[PDB]
Amino acid sequence: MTSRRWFHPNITGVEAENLLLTRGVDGSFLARPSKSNPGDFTLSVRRNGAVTHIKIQNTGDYYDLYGGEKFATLAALVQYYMEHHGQLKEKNGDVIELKYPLNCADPTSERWFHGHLSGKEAEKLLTEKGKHGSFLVRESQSHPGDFVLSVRTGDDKGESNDGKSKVTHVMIRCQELKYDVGGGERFDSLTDLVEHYKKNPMVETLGTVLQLKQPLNTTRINAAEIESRVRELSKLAEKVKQGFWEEFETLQQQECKLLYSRKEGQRQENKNKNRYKNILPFDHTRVVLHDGDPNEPVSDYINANIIMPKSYIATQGCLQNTVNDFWRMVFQENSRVIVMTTKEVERGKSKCVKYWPDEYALKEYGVMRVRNVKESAAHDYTLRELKLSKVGQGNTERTVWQYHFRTWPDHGVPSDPGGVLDFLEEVHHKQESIMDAGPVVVHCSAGIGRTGTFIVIDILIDIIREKGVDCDIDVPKTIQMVRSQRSGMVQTEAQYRFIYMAVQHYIETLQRRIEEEQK
Template sequence: MADNDIFMSSRWFSPYITSSEMEAKMKGEEYAGKDGVFGVRVSKSNPSDFVLSVWRNGAMTNIKILNHGDYYDPSIGEKFASLSDLVSYFYKNPNELKEKNGDWIHLKFPLNFDEPTEERWFHGSISSAQAEKLLQDSKIDGSFLVRRSASKMGSYVISALVKQDVFHIMVHCTDSKYHLQGGEKFVSLEALIEHYKKWSMVDNSGVVVSLKTALNSTRVNLSSFKKRKDALESTGVGEKKKDGFTEEFEYLQQQEMRQTKDRKQGQRPENKAKNRYKNILPYDDSRVRLQIGKEEDGSDYINANWIRLPDNPNEYIATQGTLSTTAKDFWQMAWETKAIVIFMVTKEVERGKNKCYRYWPTNLDTPDTHGNVTVKLDSETQDDTFIIRRMTINHVKQPKEKRQMLHYQYIAWPDHGVPKDPGPCIQGIKDIGRELDIHESRHKYRPPIIVHCSAGIGRTGTVIVLDCLINLIDKYGICVDVDVQRSISQIREKRSGMVQTAAQYKFIYDALLRYMEYYRAREKAAAENYESEYGNISSLAH
């Protein structure tokens, strides 16, 4: 997803590990000597330089990285501003790093060393510019965060906002003790921060820097995901205190209130009746336009938005549950976009209220016609969580062309709250992904996924964010950093209100934790050469 760099955390770097310890870790149970496992350590012969170690062909290959002060040089002609940039470049460009004899050196699986702290004020390897933006956006005098130093690996930086200016103070680590230059030494970063929250620091320019309010990171490496989830759950103390999930979600709500994108098309008189809810309208810049219609008279309008994100194989159409008067527009959209999958996250009626018009046939022998599109029900199966329908659609203007449509209706989402078990929801997401994989391999294009609930924002947004983050894990593995809050913010830039409640926000965390268990089980199964089926997601014991 946008702004995501899987190497942001720099967990592949360990300043004090020895060559023999690195080798033992690569050969150990977790990594099992897989070709492409890599890590970075400080050079013992010259502590200002570094060594990139890669396991390949049953042995560890070491590449010296020279530190010239203002750039890092792996002696292949390229220069990099930081170690993170260097590692990220060779990971993403596999045919750029090779030995003198011409053999390629591929970086595939980053080692995962422990972070110096699991505190939420630690932001990994964000840049000074990123830190400044975060702090200035917070507008809270005395807010602070801690990050890795880009200029001195193995050291850290406290960035703090003082009267709208950001100051950066280096934290050195010597013999596993943390200290400011010439200051008292502490056994941990936590201890150092607690000390300077009580006693202010003085910047080199003489400015007094006080640490008052921690600016917590929402980005977390998956290896620490369980600890982060536990920390968010335990944040609230007492009846009136909010847990971390609520805090992070409320920040999103505040951010949404500052959104000023136009929604003029949905407000036009000729389009108002096409909206299920008068205040839930699509952004104009990302709305789906019906090719058959015209903007001048509103005939191109449907309450739906495109969701397209970088570094994600799927694109989505997020839309409202159909009305009886918009079913023809819905099927016209499905035809024009060449969609083959619909993920419906609601029942037609919940608690006596109509949530979605039934836009599909109920009888195998009787097709329905909606505008120019005829829909035929070919099969229907049901269990406790899903009704799965296979349908055939064709268009009156293209009578010879017929398309197969898969309709997944998730019926286990409760009227209020979220499902207790995220497994079936993940199962549906994975099954739909497989359908798209098959279609792409056969037809050489990947159609969008149409996702809707009733309003097309709450459950719809939850499913889309989950799919995006699951795709990220599938691509990069457990080494990846994820940011649930940022991911929601990104899709909210395409359609407002996506992920509607703090409970849905927490559900994403629960679902990702469940998927990590499945992912690890699948990886173990692959290592032991036996099949691991998708059904394991739902059947994992809890």
């Protein structure tokens, strides 16, 4: 039960209207990218004979539901309003019920789908970029409107030598919407067909089994060849599409495989310790404070997750009652660099309180004591030299360098990654200059959007700055890997496209630098 089938990637506002009136009943719902606004998201629900279109906005921080609450993943929004029946109201006071997710048949958001592809090209990818169990679903060439499942069965590992590895093509005839292997069960979508034979593998005479283990891998590219990959993901034709949009929606369709328990944040005692009540840290990667023996009640909770591929800490904008716990986290984790990707107040709404003292001032935050030594005022950011110590104790003073990015737009992402790339280059060198410094504390508003976008860009650069330009990078796998440690890292497609532009702009400077060193 993942299932995210209730999300239709390529759907009109009128098609969703008809889809609920004919194939749905009262309570049936679906989520769709809003036509009206490229950042908006509409939740269409059949409500008393008619359809109600509730919209969800996402600027790069969270999914904000109108007349509802904010969430990290569009799936946890559905998980919330399906297990909480009386919270989605029209107000008027009439409740809107999410009871029956209406599934979709479009396979374009699946990793194993390939769109246009041919047998030789499909077989070439299965032996070059393949492995035992690798499978793909392409468009049929000869018989139109059908599909061809191409699965590789190998030597076990399947590399070196030849003769005992094999690629088996399978015909998938499509007739009156349904799909089949020319016999047996007829499925409603390629997913229902693929998911079925991933659990009931096809077997032919002489007893060979076509294990649909893992899909292929169009994603992992060499870091030097990114300027040609960004060129492919930029051509637009939506039979599809914007390459960034088709790739990102595939990454979104894998998000409910990361519905890990965040119950330590759902406790009543930690209710007001979260800036946003439904955006919570994973229990298995949360930062656990160690106040010690109470000192009632000590408490160990903070909305922060450890990010480890140099490690990171992705936290929230400090609340009034969490400034004390924040500086406890910086002390125990031995953190020395803080990345703040939000202004003190943006668009009139406060997203983070001032947790640092004014310049040349000393302030006590409970057990911790912070001195603001200096404030450097570059453009795009501000560096604050801070000394963190423990009140009533010696040999606890450490210098914490807070980097406060100030020029991130209120709506969307910047237009030039040079500011972020230069900002991260100074942040990385300051971090590496301190021996055995703790993880890098990155935060913003909710701590998933800009906070996740900054970290993923830094993770890809750390790989490139070390291993060089001839190394393999994989952005969706990098996004997904961080999303398994904090729910909803990298929010919007705009932030996702910016991560490609940042790595691209970073490779050019490296190549230009190397060439200039050769005059």
